[PDB]
Every structure is written in structure tokens, then in C-alpha cells.
């Protein structure tokens, strides 16, 4: 997870629990938290090999309005 400087520990354990729920296959996953000033208020999470993206690219998707 690479959004910004780390948030409160409650949010950290909430995201750890939701990641565990994502896995939920009799296994335990490790966590690696990163900091990215370039990434805006959103976060990008790579749960295994998935890499969802809700970050500065959302403002990039404003080109649809710019295009048409």
C-alpha cells in the first residue's frame, strides 16, 4: 500500500483485516506500507498480483471530460 505518510494504527489494522479477508484461504499475508507524495488522497494496493488503483490516476481519468 502506497498512498502517503501512514495513517492511524486503527486504519492500519482495518486494512490488514480487509486484506486478510481478501486472502481468506487458510493463509497469512505480509504487509509493506509505502509513502508517495506524488500519489494524491487515494491509495494503491497490490494484494498479491492484483494491484487495484484508486489514486492520482482518478484525476488522470478526468481526460474523459477533457476529450468529450
Amino acid at each position: 500500500v502506497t498512498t502517503a505518510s501512514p495513517l492511524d494504527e486503527a486504519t492500519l489494522t482495518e486494512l490488514k483485516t480487509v486484506l486478510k479477508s481478501f486472502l481468506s484461504k487458510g493463509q497469512i499475508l505480509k504487509l509493506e506500507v509505502k509513502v508517495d507524495p506524488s500519489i494524491m488522497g487515494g491509495m494503491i494496493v497490490r494484494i498479491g498480483e492484483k494491484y487495484v488503483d484508486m489514486s492520482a490516476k482518478t484525476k488522470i481519468q478526468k481526460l474523459s471530460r477533457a476529450m468529450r
Binding site: 494524491m40 488522497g41 487515494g42 482518478t58 484525476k59 478526468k62
Partner: protein, 69 residues
């Protein structure tokens, strides 16, 4: 969606701009003038409020002298 709502707020603020397409752009006037000049040159000379009126004439074939029986 909260980020999208903030985007919507910014769009609304731009909508309510009394100056409209000003955007505090010093080059906006120059760019608009250049685009208008290019469009006028491409379309040629014209009038914003006028009507096309013209007249013409066509002379037929002139008579040619030809004597015969």
C-alpha cells in the same frame, strides 16, 4: 466519491465564474485572437450581418455575315 464530489465542486465554481472563460489567462486573449484570425483567413473575407446580392449578363453568339442561295 468524495474526491469526485470535490471535483464537481471545482467544476461548479468554474461554472459560476462571472468572467466565464477568463481563467486568469494572460495568453487566453492572444490565443483567441490568433484562432479568430486563422479562421477568418481560412474562410476568407466575409460580413457578420449582410446578404449576398449580385447580377450578371450573358451575351449570345454574334451574327456573322454569310451569303448563300
Amino acid at each position: 466519491q468524495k474526491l469526485f464530489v470535490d471535483k464537481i465542486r471545482e467544476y461548479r465554481t468554474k461554472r459560476q465564474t462571472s468572467g466565464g472563460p477568463v481563467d486568469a489567462g494572460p495568453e487566453y486573449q492572444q490565443d483567441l485572437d490568433r484562432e479568430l484570425f486563422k479562421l477568418k483567413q481560412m474562410y476568407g473575407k466575409a460580413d457578420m450581418n449582410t446578404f449576398p446580392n449580385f447580377t450578371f449578363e450573358d451575351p449570345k453568339f454574334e451574327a456573322v455575315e454569310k451569303p448563300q442561295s
